[PDB]
Each structure stands twice: as structure tokens, then as C-alpha cells.
Amino acid sequence: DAQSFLNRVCGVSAARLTPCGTGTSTDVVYRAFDIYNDKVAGFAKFLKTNCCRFQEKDEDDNLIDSYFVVKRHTFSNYQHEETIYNLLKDCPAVAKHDFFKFRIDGDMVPHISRQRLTKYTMADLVYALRHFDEGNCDTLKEILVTYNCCDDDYFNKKDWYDFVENPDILRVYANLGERVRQALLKTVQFCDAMRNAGIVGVLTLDNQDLNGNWYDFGDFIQTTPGSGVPVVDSYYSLLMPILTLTRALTAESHVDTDLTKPYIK
Numbered sequence: 153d154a155q156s157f158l159n160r161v162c163g164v165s166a167a168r169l170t171p172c173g174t175g176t177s178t179d180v181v182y183r184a185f186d187i188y189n190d191k192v193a194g195f196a197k198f199l200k201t202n203c204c205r206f207q208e209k210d211e212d213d214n215l216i217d218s219y220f221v222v223k224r225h226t227f228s229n230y231q232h233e234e235t236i237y238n239l240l241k242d243c244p245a246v247a248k249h250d251f252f253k254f255r256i257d258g259d260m261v262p263h264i265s266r267q268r269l270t271k272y273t274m275a276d277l278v279y280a281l282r283h284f285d286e287g288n289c290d291t292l293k294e295i296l297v298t299y300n301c302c303d304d305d306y307f308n309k310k311d312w313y314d315f316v317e318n319p320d321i322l323r324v325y326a327n328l329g330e331r332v333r334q335a336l337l338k339t340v341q342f343c344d345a346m347r348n349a350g351i352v353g354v355l356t357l358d359n360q361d362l363n364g365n366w367y368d369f370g371d372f373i374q375t376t377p378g379s380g381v382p383v384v385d386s387y388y389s390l391l392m393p394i395l396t397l398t399r400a401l402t403a404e405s406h407v408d409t410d411l412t413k414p415y416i417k
């Protein structure tokens with residue numbers, strides 16, 4: 153049944169979940185991957201069809217920006233990603249994973265469940281700000297609304313996106329900055345967690361939600377501990393136009409790097 157699957161996705165964590173899809177079936181979503189394999193490459197919007205998505209509601213039954221992504225795949229990938237997670241489990245900049253095997257139709261399909269991710273990832277934000285189209289900007293509007301950058305009526309303005317007709321949009325974009333900067337800090341933790349665990353892998357923007365956690369260990373190979381290496385060449389470089397558009401480092405002008413504290417004299 154699709155309800156017992158929901159109960160297992162809830163797990164030991166006290167979570168109230170509602171299915172973003174329907175009937176223990178994968179939810180298909182148009183996302184913004186940064187991919188490179190033997191056949192395809194590039195920073196493009198693909199259509200992912202490998203994850204069952206559930207949305208959490210806080211009591212009072214309001215839907216919040218926290219999702220349980222229950223990607224199902226082959227068993228060897230399940231075991232390998234379970235081991236890589238058990239190596240990287242203790243890092244705080246790692247999404248919470250739950251590994252189980254659920255009898256879907258007549259077979260025990262192995263599912264991995266990433267808990268309390270956001271709706272969009274850092275790749276979606278970077279793509280929305282790097283491939284901007286004012287006629288088709290719905291992920292940028294949703295990202296700005298869901299993180300209290302604006303009030304969802306700010307887009308009723310004629311040219312809200314224009315930098316020279318509405319300079320106030322800068323003030324809106326800077327409201328993402330502290331959310332971006334924390335993500336950066338999370339990366340520096342995750343890299344460390346790889347380096348001390350001996351895990352080699354490429355860091356991509358689509359494996360990090362807007363909170364900052366990391367959840368994709370499929371193409372991570374482990375070496376001797378203390379000598380791993382994260383490849384962050386494409387991660388940081390694609391992010392660079394966003395680190396000044398959102399003014400991510402404005403918290404560095406304050407004493408003790410706290411936005412509430414006064415500026416450094």
C-alpha cells in the first residue's frame with residue numbers, strides 16, 4: 153500500500169508527511185543539474201524521475217519547505233551509498249539518510265530516504281540567476297518567496313527584475329546572501345569530512361539543498377582515510393556570479409561575523 157510506504161518514510165523521526173506524488177510512485181520534477189558523464193555534459197535543466205518526494209507539514213497542518221526524498225535505485229548503489237554515508241554520517245553538513253528495503257509490488261526494492269531537504273537545490277538557484285528569463289522565472293520567484301526575500305506581491309511591479317529601473321531588487325537578492333554563505337561554510341565542512349575519511353568525489357551544486365546539506369554519494373569512491381580529495385572546481389566556479397549578486401559576504405563586515413552585531417571599525 154502507499155500508506156505503509158508513507159509510514160516507513162516517516163520513520164522513527166516524528167514527521168507528518170503528505171505525498172507530493174501519488175500512490176507509492178516516483179514524482180517527476182524538472183530540475184537544474186550540473187552533469188558530466190560518458191555521454192552527456194553541461195549545466196542544464198533535466199527531468200529527474202528517480203525520486204519519490206513527500207512534503208512535511210508542521211502541526212496546524214501547514215506545508216513547510218522540508219521534503220523527504222526517497223530515491224530508489226539498484227541494490228549495489230544502495231549498499232555503496234550506505235557505506236559512504238556511514239563514513240560521512242557524523243558531519244553536520246550532511247543530510248540525514250535512512251536506508252530501508254520495502255516490498256513495492258512483489259519485490260523488496262531498496263530505497264534511500266533523504267530527510268528534510270528543501271524543494272530546490274543550489275543548482276536550481278544558480279541556474280535561475282544565471283539563465284534568467286523574465287517571461288519564465290517561476291523557480292526564482294518561488295525561491296525568493298519561500299525564504300522571505302520578498303512578499304509575493306513584489307512581482308506585481310512592472311519591471312521588478314530590472315537592475316536600473318528597480319534597483320531595490322538588489323536588496324531582495326542580498327536577502328539570499330546569508331543563506332548562500334552558510335551553504336559555503338557547509339561545503340568547507342563536507343570537504344573536510346571527505347578529506348579525513350578518504351573519500352574521492354566531485355562536488356556538484358545539485359547535491360546540496362538551499363539549507364546546505366549534502367545527500368548524493370553515488371559517484372564517491374573511498375581511498376585510505378586522511379587522504380581523500382573533493383573536486384570543487386565546477387561547484388565554486390558556477391556559484392561565483394551568485395556570491396556577489398546576493399552579497400554573500402556582507403556578514404564579514406560585522407564583528408564576530410554576526411549580522412546583528414555592529415560593523416567592524
Ligand SMILES: Nc1ncnc2c1ncn2[C@@H]1O[C@H](COP(=O)(O)OP(=O)(O)O)[C@@H](O)[C@H]1O
Nearest residue numbers: 200202223224225229358359367368369370371
Ligand atoms: N537510470 C537511473 N535510474 C535511477 N537512478 C539512477 C540512474 N542513474 C543514476 N542514478 C542514481 O542517481 C544518482 C544521481 O541522481 P540525482 O539526480 O543526483 O539524484 P540525487 O541527487 O537525489 O541522488 C546517482 O548516484 C545514481 O546512484
Ligand SMILES: [Mg+2]
Nearest residue numbers: 356358359368
Ligand atoms: Mg545528485
